[PDB]
Short mmCIF file of C-alpha atoms in Angstrom, two decimals:
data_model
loop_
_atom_site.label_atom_id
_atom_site.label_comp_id
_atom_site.label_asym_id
_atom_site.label_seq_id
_atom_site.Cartn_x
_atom_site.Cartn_y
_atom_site.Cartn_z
CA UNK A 1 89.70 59.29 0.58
CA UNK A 2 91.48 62.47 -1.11
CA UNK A 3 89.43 64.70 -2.51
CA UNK A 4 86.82 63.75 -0.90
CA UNK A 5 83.37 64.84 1.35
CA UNK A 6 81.80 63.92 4.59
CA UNK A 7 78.85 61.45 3.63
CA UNK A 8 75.77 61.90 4.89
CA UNK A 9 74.50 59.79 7.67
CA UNK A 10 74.00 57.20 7.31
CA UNK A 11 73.19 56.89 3.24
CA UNK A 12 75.90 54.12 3.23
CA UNK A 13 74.57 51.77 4.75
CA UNK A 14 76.50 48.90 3.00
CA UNK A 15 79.66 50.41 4.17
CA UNK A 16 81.60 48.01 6.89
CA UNK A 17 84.69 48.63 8.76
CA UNK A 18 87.58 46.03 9.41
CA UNK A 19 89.04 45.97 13.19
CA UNK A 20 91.99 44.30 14.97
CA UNK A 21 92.25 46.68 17.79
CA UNK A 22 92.48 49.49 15.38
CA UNK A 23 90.63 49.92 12.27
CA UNK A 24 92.40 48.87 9.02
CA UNK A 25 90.05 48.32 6.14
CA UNK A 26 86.77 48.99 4.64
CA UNK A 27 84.32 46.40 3.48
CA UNK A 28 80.68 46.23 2.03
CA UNK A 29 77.63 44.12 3.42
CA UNK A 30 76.38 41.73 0.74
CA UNK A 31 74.21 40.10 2.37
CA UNK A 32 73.24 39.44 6.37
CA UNK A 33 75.71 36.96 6.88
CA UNK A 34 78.27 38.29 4.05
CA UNK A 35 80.70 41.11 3.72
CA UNK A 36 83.51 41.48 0.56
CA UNK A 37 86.75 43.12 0.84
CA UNK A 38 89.93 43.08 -0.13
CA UNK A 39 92.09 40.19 0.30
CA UNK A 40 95.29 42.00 0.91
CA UNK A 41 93.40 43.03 4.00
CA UNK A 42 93.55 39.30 5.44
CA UNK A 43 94.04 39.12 9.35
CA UNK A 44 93.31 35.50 11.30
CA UNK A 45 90.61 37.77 13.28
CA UNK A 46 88.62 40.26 12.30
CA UNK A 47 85.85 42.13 14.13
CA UNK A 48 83.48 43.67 11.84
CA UNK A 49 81.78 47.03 12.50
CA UNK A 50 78.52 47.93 10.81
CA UNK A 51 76.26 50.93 11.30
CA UNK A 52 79.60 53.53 12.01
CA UNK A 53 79.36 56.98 10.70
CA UNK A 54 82.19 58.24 13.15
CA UNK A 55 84.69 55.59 14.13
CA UNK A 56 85.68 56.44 17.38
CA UNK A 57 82.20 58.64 18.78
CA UNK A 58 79.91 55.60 19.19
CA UNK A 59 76.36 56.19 18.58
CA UNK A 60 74.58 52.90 20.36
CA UNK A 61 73.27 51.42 17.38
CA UNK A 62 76.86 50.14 15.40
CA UNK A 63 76.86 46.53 15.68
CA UNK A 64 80.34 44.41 16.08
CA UNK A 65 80.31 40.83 14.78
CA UNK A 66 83.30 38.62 14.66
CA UNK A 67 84.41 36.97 11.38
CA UNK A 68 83.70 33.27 11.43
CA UNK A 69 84.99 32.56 8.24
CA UNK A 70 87.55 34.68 6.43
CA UNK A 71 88.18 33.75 2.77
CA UNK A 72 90.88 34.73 0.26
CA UNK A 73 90.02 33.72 -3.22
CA UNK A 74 92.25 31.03 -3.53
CA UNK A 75 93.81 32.63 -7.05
CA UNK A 76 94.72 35.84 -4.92
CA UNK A 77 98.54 36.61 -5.78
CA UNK A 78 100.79 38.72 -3.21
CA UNK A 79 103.30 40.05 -6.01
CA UNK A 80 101.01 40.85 -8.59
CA UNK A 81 97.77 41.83 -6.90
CA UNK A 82 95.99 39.50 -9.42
CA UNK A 83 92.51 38.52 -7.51
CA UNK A 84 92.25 40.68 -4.82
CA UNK A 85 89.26 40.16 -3.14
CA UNK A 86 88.02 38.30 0.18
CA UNK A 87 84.56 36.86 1.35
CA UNK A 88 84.06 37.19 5.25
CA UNK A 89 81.40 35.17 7.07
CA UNK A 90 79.67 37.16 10.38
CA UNK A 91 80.04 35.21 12.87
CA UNK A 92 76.18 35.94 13.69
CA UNK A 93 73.46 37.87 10.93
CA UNK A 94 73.90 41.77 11.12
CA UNK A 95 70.43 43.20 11.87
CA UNK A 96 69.14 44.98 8.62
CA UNK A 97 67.92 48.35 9.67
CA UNK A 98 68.02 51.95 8.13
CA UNK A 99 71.78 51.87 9.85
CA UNK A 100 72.70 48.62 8.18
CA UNK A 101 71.49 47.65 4.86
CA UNK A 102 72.92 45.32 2.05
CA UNK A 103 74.01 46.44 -1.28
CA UNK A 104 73.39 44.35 -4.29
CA UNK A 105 76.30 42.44 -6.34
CA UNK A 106 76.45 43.83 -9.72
CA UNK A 107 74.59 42.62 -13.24
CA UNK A 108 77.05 43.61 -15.98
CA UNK A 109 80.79 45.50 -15.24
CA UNK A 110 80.14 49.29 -15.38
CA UNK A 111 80.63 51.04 -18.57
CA UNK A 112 83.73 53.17 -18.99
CA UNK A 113 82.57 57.17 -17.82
CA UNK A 114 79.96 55.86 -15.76
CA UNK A 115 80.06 58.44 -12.10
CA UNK A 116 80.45 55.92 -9.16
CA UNK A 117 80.70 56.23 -5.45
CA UNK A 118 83.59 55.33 -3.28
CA UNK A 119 84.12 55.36 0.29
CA UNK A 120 85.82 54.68 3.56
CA UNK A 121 87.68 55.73 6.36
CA UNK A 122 90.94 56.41 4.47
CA UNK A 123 93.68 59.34 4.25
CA UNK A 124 92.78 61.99 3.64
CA UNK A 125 96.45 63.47 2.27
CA UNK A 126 98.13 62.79 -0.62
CA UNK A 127 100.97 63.90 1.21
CA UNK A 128 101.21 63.29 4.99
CA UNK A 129 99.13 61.52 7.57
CA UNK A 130 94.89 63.07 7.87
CA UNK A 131 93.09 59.89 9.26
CA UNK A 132 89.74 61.01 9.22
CA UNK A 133 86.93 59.18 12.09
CA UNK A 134 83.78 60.33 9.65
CA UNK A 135 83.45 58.60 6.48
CA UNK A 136 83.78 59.87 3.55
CA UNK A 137 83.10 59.86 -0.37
CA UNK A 138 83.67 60.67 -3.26
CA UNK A 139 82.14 60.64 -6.84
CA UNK A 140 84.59 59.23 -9.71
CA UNK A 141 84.51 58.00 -13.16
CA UNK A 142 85.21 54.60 -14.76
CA UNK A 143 88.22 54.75 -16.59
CA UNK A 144 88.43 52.37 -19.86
CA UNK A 145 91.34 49.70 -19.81
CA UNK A 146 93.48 52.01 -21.95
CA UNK A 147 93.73 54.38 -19.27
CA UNK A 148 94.36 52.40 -16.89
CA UNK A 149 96.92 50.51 -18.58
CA UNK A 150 98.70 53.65 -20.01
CA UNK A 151 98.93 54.98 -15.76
CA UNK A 152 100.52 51.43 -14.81
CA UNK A 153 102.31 49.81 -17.60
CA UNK A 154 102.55 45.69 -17.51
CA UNK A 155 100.56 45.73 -13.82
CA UNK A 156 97.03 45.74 -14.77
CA UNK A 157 95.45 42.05 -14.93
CA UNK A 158 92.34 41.05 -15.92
CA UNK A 159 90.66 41.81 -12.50
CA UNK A 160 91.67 45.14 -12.10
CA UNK A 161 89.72 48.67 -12.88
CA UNK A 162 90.52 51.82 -12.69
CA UNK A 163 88.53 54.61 -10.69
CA UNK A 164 89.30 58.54 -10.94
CA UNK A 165 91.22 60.92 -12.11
CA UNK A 166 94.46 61.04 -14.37
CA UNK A 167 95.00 64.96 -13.56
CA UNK A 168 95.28 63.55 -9.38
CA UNK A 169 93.53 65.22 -6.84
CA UNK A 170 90.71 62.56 -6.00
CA UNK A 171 91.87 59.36 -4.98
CA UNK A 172 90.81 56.44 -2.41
CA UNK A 173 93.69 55.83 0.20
CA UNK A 174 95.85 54.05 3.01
CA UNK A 175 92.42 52.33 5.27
CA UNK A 176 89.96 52.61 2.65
CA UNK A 177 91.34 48.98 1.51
CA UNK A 178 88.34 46.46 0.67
CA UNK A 179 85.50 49.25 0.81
CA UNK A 180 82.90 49.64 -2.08
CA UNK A 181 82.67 51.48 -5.06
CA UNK A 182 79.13 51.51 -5.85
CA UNK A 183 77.99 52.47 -9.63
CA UNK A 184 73.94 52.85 -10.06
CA UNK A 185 73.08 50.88 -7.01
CA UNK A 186 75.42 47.66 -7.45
CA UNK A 187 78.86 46.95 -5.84
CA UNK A 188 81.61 46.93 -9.22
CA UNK A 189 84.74 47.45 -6.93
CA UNK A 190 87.08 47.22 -3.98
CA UNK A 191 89.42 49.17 -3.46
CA UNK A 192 92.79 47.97 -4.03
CA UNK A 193 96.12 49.80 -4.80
CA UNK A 194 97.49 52.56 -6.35
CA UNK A 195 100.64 54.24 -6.89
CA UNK A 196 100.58 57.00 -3.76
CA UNK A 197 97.13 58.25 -3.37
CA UNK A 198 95.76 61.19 -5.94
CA UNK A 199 99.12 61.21 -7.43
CA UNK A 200 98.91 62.59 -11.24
CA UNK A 201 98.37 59.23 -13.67
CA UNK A 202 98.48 57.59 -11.06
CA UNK A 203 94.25 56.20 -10.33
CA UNK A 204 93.20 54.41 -8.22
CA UNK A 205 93.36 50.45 -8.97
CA UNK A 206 90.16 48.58 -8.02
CA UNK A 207 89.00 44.43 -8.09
CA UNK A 208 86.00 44.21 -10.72
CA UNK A 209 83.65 42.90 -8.67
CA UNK A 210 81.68 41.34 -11.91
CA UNK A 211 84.19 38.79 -12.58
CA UNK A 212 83.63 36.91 -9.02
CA UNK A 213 79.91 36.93 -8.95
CA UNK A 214 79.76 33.06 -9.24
CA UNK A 215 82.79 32.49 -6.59
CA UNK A 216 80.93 34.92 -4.03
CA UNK A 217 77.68 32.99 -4.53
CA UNK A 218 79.33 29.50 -4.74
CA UNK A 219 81.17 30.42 -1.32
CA UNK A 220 77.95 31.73 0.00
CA UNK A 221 76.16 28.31 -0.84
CA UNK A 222 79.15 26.24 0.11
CA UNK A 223 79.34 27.80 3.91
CA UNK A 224 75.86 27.28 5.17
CA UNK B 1 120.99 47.28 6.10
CA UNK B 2 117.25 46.78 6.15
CA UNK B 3 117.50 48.87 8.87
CA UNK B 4 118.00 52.02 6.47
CA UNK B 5 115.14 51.75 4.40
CA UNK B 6 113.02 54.36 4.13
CA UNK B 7 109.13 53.57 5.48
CA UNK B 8 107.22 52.22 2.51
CA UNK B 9 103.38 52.09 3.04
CA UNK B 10 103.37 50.43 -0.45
CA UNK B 11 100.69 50.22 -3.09
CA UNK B 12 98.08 48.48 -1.19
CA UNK B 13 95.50 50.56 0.56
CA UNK B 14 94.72 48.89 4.02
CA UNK B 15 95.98 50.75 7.43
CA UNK B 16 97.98 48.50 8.82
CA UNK B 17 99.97 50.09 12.13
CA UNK B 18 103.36 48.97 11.54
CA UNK B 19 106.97 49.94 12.86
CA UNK B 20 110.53 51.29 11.23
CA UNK B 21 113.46 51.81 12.59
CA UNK B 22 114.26 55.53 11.22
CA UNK B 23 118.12 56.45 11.29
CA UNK B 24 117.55 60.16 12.17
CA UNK B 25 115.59 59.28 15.45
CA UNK B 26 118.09 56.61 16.26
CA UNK B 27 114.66 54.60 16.77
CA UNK B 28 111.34 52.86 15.92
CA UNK B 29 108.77 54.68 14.94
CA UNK B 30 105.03 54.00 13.60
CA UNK B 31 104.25 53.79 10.61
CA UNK B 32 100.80 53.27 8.27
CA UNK B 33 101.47 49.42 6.25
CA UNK B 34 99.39 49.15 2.75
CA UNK B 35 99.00 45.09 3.12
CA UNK B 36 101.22 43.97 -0.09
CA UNK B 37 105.28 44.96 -1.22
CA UNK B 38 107.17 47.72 1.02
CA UNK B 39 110.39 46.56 2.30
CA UNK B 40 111.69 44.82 5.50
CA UNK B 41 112.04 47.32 8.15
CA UNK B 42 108.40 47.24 8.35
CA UNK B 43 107.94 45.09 12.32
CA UNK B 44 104.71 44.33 14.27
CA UNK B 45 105.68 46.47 17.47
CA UNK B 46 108.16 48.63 18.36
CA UNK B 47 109.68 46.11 21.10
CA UNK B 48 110.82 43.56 18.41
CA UNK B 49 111.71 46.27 15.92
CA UNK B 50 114.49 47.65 18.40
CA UNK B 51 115.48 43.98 19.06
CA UNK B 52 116.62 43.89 15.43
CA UNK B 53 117.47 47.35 14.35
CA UNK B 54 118.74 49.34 17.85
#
């Protein structure tokens, strides 16, 4: 995150992290079994972290759960980014507590100008390398298609949103892959791409979370 | 010749701990991977990237 602050602890308590001896994505806790990301961020393992304010200054009460299941949606395209988003399965039911909490899947897409709240573990430079172990936030508008169209001509597809700021500055980042943006208490996004990170008209690109409610619950039902 | 491409973390947003082969160092060094595009001197570890690029 560029642009960014430190989040309070924990008052994101949705907030995952992805692991393969390092840490390499973001996520969000749908439900106790459940976690979306990103499907760009696709290993054949994945150890999920829950509870984790600071990454690396362990607190006791962070829980690590394996991925049983690790889902792509099966539209997801490589080249064009088209469908970008990935179901994992815990491999046994986080513990809901005030560390680790679920946040609820979303009842319309956000209106355009509507303030929501991104997050993760991301850089923290738009130019150069600031990896930061707290998380952190930060508070951006919906853009409306035009926008986002006009900062990446012939890219954005139907599953795609943009997130902050055309004058740059505040941005999500390299690591904050597959985290939440959260608008009014529901999940609408997950972080995706961008061209560089807080670059001017360049926003962040993010998967509309709205437009796979059916597919998350239909993979939910089909893997019990 | 792939190994003279510059680094590219492209578009994608994940932190993925990669390796290049950069030309000034005469050797591999680390890199942050996005997840999608980038280029081909982009290697898993820095063994196998100097068996291809040093």
């Amino acid at each position: 995150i560029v642009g960014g602050y430190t989040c309070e602890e924990n008052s994101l308590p949705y907030q995952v992290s992805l692991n393969s001896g390092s840490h390499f994505c973001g996520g969000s806790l749908i439900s106790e079994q459940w976690v979306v990301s990103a499907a760009h961020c696709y290993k054949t393992r994945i150890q999920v972290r829950l509870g984790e304010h600071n990454i690396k200054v362990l607190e006791g009460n962070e829980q690590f759960i394996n991925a049983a299941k690790i889902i792509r949606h099966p539209k997801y395209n490589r080249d064009t980014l088209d469908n970008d988003i990935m179901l994992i399965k815990l491999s046994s039911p986080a513990v809901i507590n005030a560390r680790v909490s679920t946040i609820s899947l979303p009842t319309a897409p956000p209106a355009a100008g509507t303030e929501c709240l991104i997050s993760g573990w991301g850089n923290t430079l738009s130019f150069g390398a600031d990896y930061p172990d707290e998380l952190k936030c930060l508070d951006a508008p919906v853009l409306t298609q035009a926008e986002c169209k006009a900062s990446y001509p012939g890219k954005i597809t139907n599953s795609m949103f943009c997130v902050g700021f055309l004058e740059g500055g505040k941005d999500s980042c390299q690591r904050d892959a597959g985290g939440p943006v959260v608008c009014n208490g529901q999940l609408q996004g997950v972080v995706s791409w961008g061209h560089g990170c807080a670059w001017k008209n360049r926003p962040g690109v993010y998967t509309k979370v709205y437009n796979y409610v059916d597919w998350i619950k239909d993979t939910i039902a089909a893997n019990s | 010749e792939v190994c003279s491409e510059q680094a590219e973390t492209g578009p994608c947003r994940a932190g993925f701990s990669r390796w290049y082969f950069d030309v000034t160092e005469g050797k591999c060094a680390p890199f942050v991977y996005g997840g999608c595009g980038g280029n081909r001197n982009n290697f898993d570890t820095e063994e196998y990237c100097m068996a291809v690029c040093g």
